[PDB]
Amino acid sequence: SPTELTTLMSCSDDKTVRLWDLPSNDPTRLFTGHTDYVRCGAFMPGSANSNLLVSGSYDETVRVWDARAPGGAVMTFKHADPIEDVLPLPSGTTLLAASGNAISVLDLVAAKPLRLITNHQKTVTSLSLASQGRRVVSGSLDGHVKVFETTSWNVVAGAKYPSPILSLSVITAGASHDDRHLAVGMQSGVLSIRTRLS
């Protein structure tokens, strides 16, 4: 959890995500509701959303739970693709669910999907946030990396790697969090690091 230093979430494979407290030897809370593999998860950053989890399953469902009511999903969203990745925005309102050949920007303040964005040919694998929370970079199994603006969501820049890529993240150096260098891990098994200095 980005706020509490001793609380973590875990999406297993079976049907469950669960919140653990580090000193304890038992899950603090248990959350069900999915029906297939669940394989992406995130906390909700922001001040008001202190305890909200989002998880994307392979049952084409992105669910967001409150950690105060250990029942069902507070909100759910059903796509038509296996949902591989999820990131919230640092603003706390909108969310990106990367599922199949298209990512989907969804609103949580109105529980209504904003826009389906298709640009990739095999499935998209991993999203990451970039330069100042201002650009979402996406990495897809077509060996393709493509960075979008987040205001109007047009395909701003991109590049191609010699192998299908699986995980991707630009990482920051330090003060003011300028993106130091971007890493991409591909199927062939090599970590490609592209570095920029300033």
Binding site: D13, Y37, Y58, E60, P82, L141, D142
Partner: protein
């Protein structure tokens, strides 16, 4: 004509002597031109030794009809030889030319590809050049793996004969000339058979094979079942993709594909496709359930393939093993199940395996197929029924089995251990009624008139 052939070898000998040695030179090369005519006749004739003679005079020509260091050799005359060899139906001539010259020497391969491109740009001849193009099987690996030429390994270091991409280029151009002309049905079946091992590696760029393959793949049938390997090879190498690959696979797996012959190759590709990691449990359960309902009418050499593969899928994806052991949780559910029997929630003939309800089904088909007539098939379904001890079963042990293999197996067992017979045999083997023994008639007789 054996004295004519001895004359031919003698003239070849003196010709290579004068070429390695050397108002008159006009006739001195007129000897070579009318010997080219004589040699084309002797190739239309023994033709194998005239063909070796042809390669000898070509080597001599390349060596010394010039002033420069470079050895050029006549694409025109070699194209004439290619014309006569590939028009002449002499299979032994063609077999010699394939094994000794093309499948050995890189320059012969390269210029043969180019001359084939020319000769094909300008039906029996088509089938023959197809046989030769299949006869070129192995691809050289690297620029330093070429490393054997017939004439003049060029010292340029950037010569197209030394650049491996030019070899692939000319092979690609010959195969495209063949396809742009057009090929028949048995030929397209042979190419879609031999494509992923011998054809697409011979291309600099395999993208025309991708387009032709997705045409033949979305066509349908055993042609698509063959095309699967080429499409997978393309996706593997240059990640050109299919729109809906897994749903196309699920709708591809159909009635007669188990009985179809190419099921060994199909099952190897299917093994990789379902050994991939990013695959939902509902989808792998859908593959399992549809394949079990088709195993209900599969042949035994297909059931022995399908079952240990099922065991490996169950060891890998334990969310699917609820299709072998599903205790009804609530006593209300148990009471409902006792009142009305459980109907299978599986929906056959559904488009998407993501939305078939294979989860909440069971392997009733496999527990029934336990009672198969063959003992080996019965024991192999009993491996699903019994316990999970061995960690995996390699499929190579179970593939490539046939009725011929089962019959040779029941042959290659011992001649006879002392066997058992049937006591109290009736005398009314073919009697229609026999109402004085009260043993019921054999149904064979009760439904077959013998008279």
């Amino acid at each position: 004509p054996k004295w004519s052939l001895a004359a031919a070898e003698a003239l070849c000998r003196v010709f290579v002597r004068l070429l390695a040695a050397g108002t008159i030179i006009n006739w001195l090369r007129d000897r070579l031109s009318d010997y080219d005519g004589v040699l084309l006749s002797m190739l239309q004739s023994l033709a194998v030794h005239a063909l070796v003679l042809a390669m000898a005079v070509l080597k001599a020509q390349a060596q010394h009809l010039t002033d420069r260091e470079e050895a050029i050799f006549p694409r025109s005359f070699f194209l004439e030889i290619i014309a006569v060899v590939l028009e002449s139906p002499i299979e032994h001539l063609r077999g010699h030319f394939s094994e000794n010259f093309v499948k050995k020497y890189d320059d012969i391969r390269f210029y043969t590809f180019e001359a084939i491109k020319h000769f094909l740009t300008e039906e029996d001849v088509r089938n023959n050049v197809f046989n030769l193009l299949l006869s070129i099987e192995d691809v050289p690996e690297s620029n330093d793996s070429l490393e054997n030429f017939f004439i003049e390994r060029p010292p340029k270091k950037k010569h197209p004969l030394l650049s491996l991409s030019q070899h692939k280029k000319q092979a690609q151009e010959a195969w495209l000339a063949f396809m742009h002309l057009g090929l028949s049905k048995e030929q397209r079946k042979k190419v879609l058979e031999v494509m992923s091992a011998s054809i697409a590696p011979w291309f600099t760029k395999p993208e025309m094979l991708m387009d032709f393959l997705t045409d033949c793949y979305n066509s349908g049938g055993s042609v698509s079942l063959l095309a699967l390997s080429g499409v997978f090879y393309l996706i593997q190498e240059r990640n050109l993709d299919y729109p809906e690959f897994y749903t196309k696979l699920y709708s591809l797996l159909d009635a007669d594909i188990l009985h179809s012959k190419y099921r060994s190759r199909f099952f190897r590709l299917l093994d990789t496709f379902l050994a991939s990691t990013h695959l939902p449990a509902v989808l792998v359960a859908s593959f399992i359930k549809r394949l079990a309902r088709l195993a209900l009418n599969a042949p035994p050499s297909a059931i022995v393939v399908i079952v240990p593969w099922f065991y490996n899928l169950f060891k890998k994806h334990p969310l699917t093993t609820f299709m072998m052991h599903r205790v009804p949780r609530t006593k209300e559910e148990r009471e409902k199940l006792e009142k009305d029997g459980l109907d299978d929630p599986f929906l056959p003939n559904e488009t998407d395996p993501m939305e078939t309800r294979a989860i909440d089904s069971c392997l009733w088909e496999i527990v029934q197929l336990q009672s198969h007539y063959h003992p080996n098939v019965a024991t192999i379904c009993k491996i699903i029924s019994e316990q999970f001890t061995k960690q995996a079963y390699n499929l190579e042990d179970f593939l490539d089995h046939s009725y011929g293999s089962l019959l040779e197996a029941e042959m290659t067992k011992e001649v006879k251990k002392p066997p058992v017979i049937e006591f109290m045999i009736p005398k009314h083997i073919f009697t229609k009624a026999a109402p004085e023994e009260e043993k019921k008639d054999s149904l064979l007789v009760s439904l077959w008139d013998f008279g």
